[PDB]
C-alpha cells in the first residue's frame, strides 16, 4: 500500500483490490481496522472513488445513523466478487440497527418496520420479535425493558462504583 520512499503502489487493479478489502472489513464489523488501514492507504487518491466510494460512504452514513443512505445500490459496478460483500453487509448492519431500535422505539405495527429495522420485510421483524422476545400483541413493546436499564448514574449506599468505601477511605490516609 505504501512501500519505500515511493515504489509506485499504483496499479490499474489496485482500485479493484481496495474495493473488496474495505468492504470485507465492514462486513466483519472490523470498524477499527477500516480506520487504521485508511491512514496507511495514500496511493488510493490516484485510484479515485467510484468502487471506493461505496465503503467510505457506507461507513459514514452508518456512523451518522441514517438508514436510507446505507445503500448497497452502488458498489456492484465491477461485480465479480463485489456481490458477495453486498449480501453479507446488509445482514450484519441490520442486526446492529435492530439493537438500536430495541432501545429506541416503543411499538411497531407492521408497516414502518422495513425502514426502522433496516430489515428487508415486516415479516422478518415479527420473526426476530419471537427470537429476542420483543413481541407483545400484534405490535412489539421492546422499549420498556430496554430503556429503563440504561440509568446507572444512580449510587447505592456506600460507594462501590468507584471502589468500595472501606478500602477507598483507608487509601486516602495512606497517601499522606
Amino acid at each position: 500500500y505504501f512501500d519505500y520512499k515511493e515504489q509506485l503502489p499504483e496499479s490499474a487493479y489496485m482500485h479493484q483490490l481496495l474495493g473488496l478489502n474495505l468492504l470485507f472489513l465492514l462486513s466483519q464489523n472490523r470498524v477499527a481496522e477500516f480506520h487504521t488501514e485508511l491512514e496507511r492507504l495514500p496511493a488510493k487518491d490516484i485510484q479515485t472513488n467510484v468502487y471506493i466510494k461505496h465503503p467510505v460512504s457506507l461507513e459514514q452514513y452508518l456512523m451518522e445513523g441514517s438508514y436510507n443512505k446505507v445503500f448497497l445500490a452502488k458498489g456492484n459496478i465491477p461485480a465479480e466478487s463485489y456481490t458477495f460483500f453486498i449480501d453479507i453487509l446488509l445482514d450484519t448492519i441490520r442486526d446492529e440497527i435492530a439493537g438500536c431500535i430495541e432501545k429506541a422505539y416503543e411499538k411497531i405495527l407492521f408497516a414502518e418496520a422495513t425502514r426502522i429495522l433496516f430489515f428487508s420485510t415486516p415479516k422478518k421483524m415479527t420473526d426476530y420479535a419471537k427470537k429476542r422476545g420483543w413481541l407483545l400483541g400484534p405490535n412489539n413493546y421492546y422499549s420498556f425493558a430496554s430503556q429503563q436499564q440504561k440509568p446507572e448514574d444512580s449510587t447505592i449506599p456506600s460507594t462501590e462504583l468507584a471502589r468500595q468505601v472501606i478500602e477507598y477511605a483507608r487509601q486516602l490516609e495512606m497517601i499522606v
Partner: protein, 155 residues
C-alpha cells in the same frame, strides 16, 4: 532523674575520703539552681547512674490505658456531627488562603520578626493550614471506616 547522694564536709575531702565516693559512676551535668548546686553535686557522688529492674510482663500492664479501648476505638458519635466537623474546617481554611497567596513568594526565611512583614509571618498561614489539614484528615477517615466496617459485620 533520680540521683542518690551522700554528704560529706570539706575537712574530709582534703584527707581524701571524698574521691572514693566519686569513683565508679557515669556523670551527667545539671544545673537547676546555679553553680552553688553544681559544687555540692560534684563533691557528693556527681550524678549517679540509676537503672531499673523490670521484666516484659510488668511493662505491658503499664502500656495499655484500659480494656475498653476495644469498644471505644470503634465507637463513633453521630454522623451529623462528623459532617459538621468537615464543614467547620473548610470555612476556616478559606480564610487563611488569602494570606498564603502573598507568602509563597518567599517564606523559607529565617527569623520570625523579619518574616512578619515580608511573607505574613504575623499569624503564619502555613502553620494554620497544616494544623487544619491534620486534624480534619485523621478524624474523617477513622469515623467513616468504623461505621462502615460495623455495618457489614452486623447487617
Amino acid at each position: 532523674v533520680i540521683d542518690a547522694f551522700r554528704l560529706i564536709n570539706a575537712n574530709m575531702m582534703v584527707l581524701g575520703h571524698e574521691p572514693r565516693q566519686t569513683t565508679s559512676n557515669l556523670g551527667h551535668l545539671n544545673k537547676p539552681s546555679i553553680q552553688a548546686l553544681i559544687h555540692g553535686l560534684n563533691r557528693h557522688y556527681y550524678s549517679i547512674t540509676i537503672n531499673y529492674r523490670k521484666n516484659e510482663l510488668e511493662q505491658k500492664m503499664l502500656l495499655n490505658l484500659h480494656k475498653k479501648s476495644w469498644m471505644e476505638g470503634l465507637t463513633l458519635q453521630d454522623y451529623s456531627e462528623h459532617c459538621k466537623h468537615n464543614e467547620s474546617v473548610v470555612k476556616e481554611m478559606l480564610e487563611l488562603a488569602k494570606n498564603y497567596n502573598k507568602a509563597v513568594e518567599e517564606e523559607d526565611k529565617m527569623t520570625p520578626e523579619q518574616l512578619a512583614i515580608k511573607n505574613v509571618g504575623k499569624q503564619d498561614p502555613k502553620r494554620h493550614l497544616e494544623e487544619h489539614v491534620d486534624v480534619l484528615m485523621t478524624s474523617n477517615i477513622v469515623q467513616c471506616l468504623a461505621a462502615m466496617l460495623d455495618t457489614v459485620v452486623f447487617k
